[PDB]
């Protein structure tokens, strides 16, 4: 997840990431956003629900 | 473009350990379901090893089941195949085969150049 996306997610309502099966790592990067209503993660290959 | 090159093929006495390697191209090694094929002299080309994408499941023919181990290694775009205690029937020419391309542009299938392995 980019730094710019994390910065802009402070006022983001819907976040959608379609990684096409590419492995994605959050590494404690979503707690910055607290106004998100949608967190679609299609084909993010998480293998684990992020903490 | 997309291309594959075989390496590690060479003559070796029976009972030795061989580690064939392949040099791949822009198509992801993590993706691009991959094959290790053999063509034996006085025989028709027959599939040996199969490594899958998104799960890394191994497939083998019955004649090559038990003493052949295939794997795909990323961050270097490599496909490896280890044979231990090869029997005289293993003498053939081994290729790397791509039947599915990468995530995008899904380019056609290309056969590898191949290396000849001999068992004495």
mmCIF file of C-alpha atoms in Angstrom:
data_model
loop_
_atom_site.group_PDB
_atom_site.id
_atom_site.type_symbol
_atom_site.label_atom_id
_atom_site.label_comp_id
_atom_site.label_asym_id
_atom_site.label_seq_id
_atom_site.Cartn_x
_atom_site.Cartn_y
_atom_site.Cartn_z
ATOM 1 C CA UNK A 1 0.000 0.000 0.000
ATOM 2 C CA UNK A 2 1.560 3.347 -1.007
ATOM 3 C CA UNK A 3 2.404 6.090 1.465
ATOM 4 C CA UNK A 4 0.366 8.569 -0.592
ATOM 5 C CA UNK A 5 -2.661 6.255 -0.437
ATOM 6 C CA UNK A 6 -2.300 5.962 3.341
ATOM 7 C CA UNK A 7 -2.123 9.757 3.597
ATOM 8 C CA UNK A 8 -5.179 10.287 1.386
ATOM 9 C CA UNK A 9 -7.227 7.589 3.135
ATOM 10 C CA UNK A 10 -7.889 9.898 6.092
ATOM 11 C CA UNK A 11 -10.940 11.203 4.192
ATOM 12 C CA UNK A 12 -11.529 8.145 1.989
ATOM 13 C CA UNK A 13 -14.941 6.448 2.058
ATOM 14 C CA UNK A 14 -14.267 3.480 -0.255
ATOM 15 C CA UNK A 15 -10.918 1.758 -0.836
ATOM 16 C CA UNK A 16 -10.681 -0.925 -3.534
ATOM 17 C CA UNK A 17 -7.475 -2.798 -4.398
ATOM 18 C CA UNK A 18 -7.404 -5.462 -7.128
ATOM 19 C CA UNK A 19 -3.900 -6.917 -6.890
ATOM 20 C CA UNK A 20 -4.606 -9.695 -9.447
ATOM 21 C CA UNK A 21 -3.261 -12.291 -7.032
ATOM 22 C CA UNK A 22 -0.074 -10.382 -6.213
ATOM 23 C CA UNK A 23 0.974 -10.762 -2.584
ATOM 24 C CA UNK A 24 0.094 -7.639 -0.593
ATOM 25 C CA UNK A 25 1.466 -6.676 2.828
ATOM 26 C CA UNK A 26 -0.195 -4.107 5.085
ATOM 27 C CA UNK A 27 2.386 -4.106 7.910
ATOM 28 C CA UNK A 28 0.332 -1.839 10.178
ATOM 29 C CA UNK A 29 -0.735 0.690 7.545
ATOM 30 C CA UNK A 30 -4.560 0.720 7.714
ATOM 31 C CA UNK A 31 -5.092 2.137 11.220
ATOM 32 C CA UNK A 32 -4.349 5.613 9.839
ATOM 33 C CA UNK A 33 -7.665 5.502 7.969
ATOM 34 C CA UNK A 34 -10.671 5.609 10.305
ATOM 35 C CA UNK A 35 -13.440 6.849 7.970
ATOM 36 C CA UNK A 36 -13.323 4.016 5.423
ATOM 37 C CA UNK A 37 -16.658 2.324 4.747
ATOM 38 C CA UNK A 38 -15.486 -0.159 2.086
ATOM 39 C CA UNK A 39 -12.229 -2.145 2.131
ATOM 40 C CA UNK A 40 -12.562 -4.296 -0.983
ATOM 41 C CA UNK A 41 -9.424 -6.426 -1.399
ATOM 42 C CA UNK A 42 -10.130 -8.452 -4.534
ATOM 43 C CA UNK A 43 -7.274 -10.822 -5.429
ATOM 44 C CA UNK A 44 -4.871 -9.333 -2.876
ATOM 45 C CA UNK A 45 -3.499 -12.805 -1.970
ATOM 46 C CA UNK A 46 -3.487 -11.883 1.720
ATOM 47 C CA UNK A 47 -3.715 -15.501 2.997
ATOM 48 C CA UNK A 48 -4.472 -13.841 6.352
ATOM 49 C CA UNK A 49 -7.008 -11.240 7.456
ATOM 50 C CA UNK A 50 -4.933 -8.144 8.326
ATOM 51 C CA UNK A 51 -4.798 -7.187 11.987
ATOM 52 C CA UNK B 1 10.205 -10.869 -24.887
ATOM 53 C CA UNK B 2 9.710 -14.302 -23.294
ATOM 54 C CA UNK B 3 12.320 -17.059 -23.525
ATOM 55 C CA UNK B 4 13.753 -19.888 -21.430
ATOM 56 C CA UNK B 5 17.231 -21.431 -21.342
ATOM 57 C CA UNK B 6 18.156 -24.815 -19.872
ATOM 58 C CA UNK B 7 21.315 -25.337 -17.834
ATOM 59 C CA UNK B 8 23.007 -27.976 -15.714
ATOM 60 C CA UNK B 9 22.570 -30.780 -18.242
ATOM 61 C CA UNK B 10 25.610 -33.014 -18.553
ATOM 62 C CA UNK B 11 26.828 -36.583 -18.657
ATOM 63 C CA UNK B 12 27.020 -38.264 -15.254
ATOM 64 C CA UNK B 13 27.511 -41.805 -13.994
ATOM 65 C CA UNK B 14 24.548 -43.680 -12.543
ATOM 66 C CA UNK B 15 23.810 -42.871 -8.908
ATOM 67 C CA UNK B 16 24.826 -39.218 -9.111
ATOM 68 C CA UNK B 17 22.780 -36.179 -8.121
ATOM 69 C CA UNK B 18 21.811 -33.677 -10.819
ATOM 70 C CA UNK B 19 20.213 -30.244 -10.395
ATOM 71 C CA UNK B 20 18.876 -28.910 -13.691
ATOM 72 C CA UNK B 21 18.139 -25.179 -13.702
ATOM 73 C CA UNK B 22 16.244 -22.882 -16.047
ATOM 74 C CA UNK B 23 16.729 -19.189 -16.794
ATOM 75 C CA UNK B 24 13.341 -17.587 -17.428
ATOM 76 C CA UNK B 25 12.155 -14.214 -18.752
ATOM 77 C CA UNK B 26 9.732 -11.395 -17.925
ATOM 78 C CA UNK B 27 6.899 -13.821 -17.208
ATOM 79 C CA UNK B 28 6.658 -14.400 -13.432
ATOM 80 C CA UNK B 29 8.067 -17.640 -12.081
ATOM 81 C CA UNK B 30 5.459 -17.473 -9.303
ATOM 82 C CA UNK B 31 2.822 -17.406 -12.049
ATOM 83 C CA UNK B 32 3.251 -19.178 -15.428
ATOM 84 C CA UNK B 33 2.467 -22.822 -14.683
ATOM 85 C CA UNK B 34 5.684 -24.595 -15.581
ATOM 86 C CA UNK B 35 6.844 -27.920 -17.015
ATOM 87 C CA UNK B 36 10.080 -29.900 -17.153
ATOM 88 C CA UNK B 37 9.963 -32.085 -20.271
ATOM 89 C CA UNK B 38 12.224 -34.808 -21.636
ATOM 90 C CA UNK B 39 12.764 -36.201 -25.129
ATOM 91 C CA UNK B 40 14.515 -39.487 -25.143
ATOM 92 C CA UNK B 41 16.608 -40.720 -28.086
ATOM 93 C CA UNK B 42 14.762 -43.516 -29.831
ATOM 94 C CA UNK B 43 11.624 -42.311 -28.044
ATOM 95 C CA UNK B 44 8.968 -39.599 -28.158
ATOM 96 C CA UNK B 45 9.052 -36.506 -25.954
ATOM 97 C CA UNK B 46 7.294 -37.211 -22.659
ATOM 98 C CA UNK B 47 6.397 -34.930 -19.760
ATOM 99 C CA UNK B 48 8.340 -35.403 -16.532
ATOM 100 C CA UNK B 49 7.770 -32.664 -13.958
ATOM 101 C CA UNK B 50 4.985 -30.135 -13.424
ATOM 102 C CA UNK B 51 4.988 -27.202 -10.994
ATOM 103 C CA UNK B 52 1.832 -25.129 -10.594
ATOM 104 C CA UNK B 53 1.183 -21.481 -9.850
ATOM 105 C CA UNK B 54 -0.809 -20.310 -6.812
ATOM 106 C CA UNK B 55 -0.243 -23.344 -4.620
ATOM 107 C CA UNK B 56 2.951 -24.905 -6.010
ATOM 108 C CA UNK B 57 1.575 -28.420 -6.502
ATOM 109 C CA UNK B 58 3.821 -31.047 -8.073
ATOM 110 C CA UNK B 59 2.840 -33.511 -10.795
ATOM 111 C CA UNK B 60 4.882 -36.381 -12.213
ATOM 112 C CA UNK B 61 4.531 -39.334 -14.536
ATOM 113 C CA UNK B 62 4.561 -42.791 -12.969
ATOM 114 C CA UNK B 63 7.961 -43.622 -14.472
ATOM 115 C CA UNK B 64 9.456 -40.432 -12.985
ATOM 116 C CA UNK B 65 7.579 -40.562 -9.661
ATOM 117 C CA UNK B 66 9.632 -40.868 -6.467
ATOM 118 C CA UNK B 67 13.158 -39.721 -7.360
ATOM 119 C CA UNK B 68 12.503 -36.356 -9.060
ATOM 120 C CA UNK B 69 11.808 -33.096 -7.214
ATOM 121 C CA UNK B 70 10.771 -29.936 -9.075
ATOM 122 C CA UNK B 71 10.425 -26.441 -7.639
ATOM 123 C CA UNK B 72 10.031 -22.827 -8.730
ATOM 124 C CA UNK B 73 12.060 -20.096 -7.027
ATOM 125 C CA UNK B 74 11.110 -16.422 -7.294
ATOM 126 C CA UNK B 75 13.161 -13.225 -6.776
ATOM 127 C CA UNK B 76 15.451 -14.803 -9.373
ATOM 128 C CA UNK B 77 12.893 -16.203 -11.875
ATOM 129 C CA UNK B 78 14.226 -19.757 -11.738
ATOM 130 C CA UNK B 79 12.916 -23.304 -12.113
ATOM 131 C CA UNK B 80 14.916 -26.144 -10.546
ATOM 132 C CA UNK B 81 14.690 -29.924 -10.888
ATOM 133 C CA UNK B 82 16.696 -32.388 -8.785
ATOM 134 C CA UNK B 83 17.193 -36.052 -9.679
ATOM 135 C CA UNK B 84 18.977 -38.380 -7.253
ATOM 136 C CA UNK B 85 20.368 -41.775 -8.299
ATOM 137 C CA UNK B 86 19.378 -41.462 -11.950
ATOM 138 C CA UNK B 87 18.838 -44.747 -13.801
ATOM 139 C CA UNK B 88 20.128 -45.558 -17.312
ATOM 140 C CA UNK B 89 16.693 -44.822 -18.809
ATOM 141 C CA UNK B 90 17.053 -41.145 -17.822
ATOM 142 C CA UNK B 91 19.390 -40.429 -20.773
ATOM 143 C CA UNK B 92 17.457 -37.817 -22.764
ATOM 144 C CA UNK B 93 17.245 -34.118 -23.674
ATOM 145 C CA UNK B 94 15.470 -31.983 -21.075
ATOM 146 C CA UNK B 95 13.547 -28.784 -21.854
ATOM 147 C CA UNK B 96 11.656 -26.191 -19.856
ATOM 148 C CA UNK B 97 8.106 -25.684 -21.102
ATOM 149 C CA UNK B 98 5.731 -22.785 -20.449
ATOM 150 C CA UNK B 99 2.081 -23.566 -21.171
ATOM 151 C CA UNK B 100 0.558 -20.524 -19.435
ATOM 152 C CA UNK B 101 2.154 -17.087 -19.699
ATOM 153 C CA UNK B 102 2.203 -14.325 -17.085
ATOM 154 C CA UNK B 103 -0.715 -12.371 -15.654
ATOM 155 C CA UNK B 104 -0.992 -10.036 -18.650
ATOM 156 C CA UNK B 105 -0.577 -10.238 -22.443
ATOM 157 C CA UNK B 106 -0.782 -14.049 -22.157
ATOM 158 C CA UNK B 107 1.916 -14.681 -24.746
ATOM 159 C CA UNK B 108 2.085 -17.942 -26.704
ATOM 160 C CA UNK B 109 3.939 -21.035 -25.485
ATOM 161 C CA UNK B 110 7.673 -21.255 -26.196
ATOM 162 C CA UNK B 111 9.830 -24.373 -25.899
ATOM 163 C CA UNK B 112 13.209 -24.290 -24.194
ATOM 164 C CA UNK B 113 16.553 -24.834 -25.873
ATOM 165 C CA UNK B 114 17.275 -27.975 -23.874
ATOM 166 C CA UNK B 115 20.262 -29.780 -22.402
ATOM 167 C CA UNK B 116 21.253 -33.404 -22.966
ATOM 168 C CA UNK B 117 21.753 -35.606 -19.898
ATOM 169 C CA UNK B 118 23.334 -39.063 -20.105
ATOM 170 C CA UNK B 119 23.412 -41.942 -17.617
ATOM 171 C CA UNK B 120 26.148 -44.556 -17.929
#
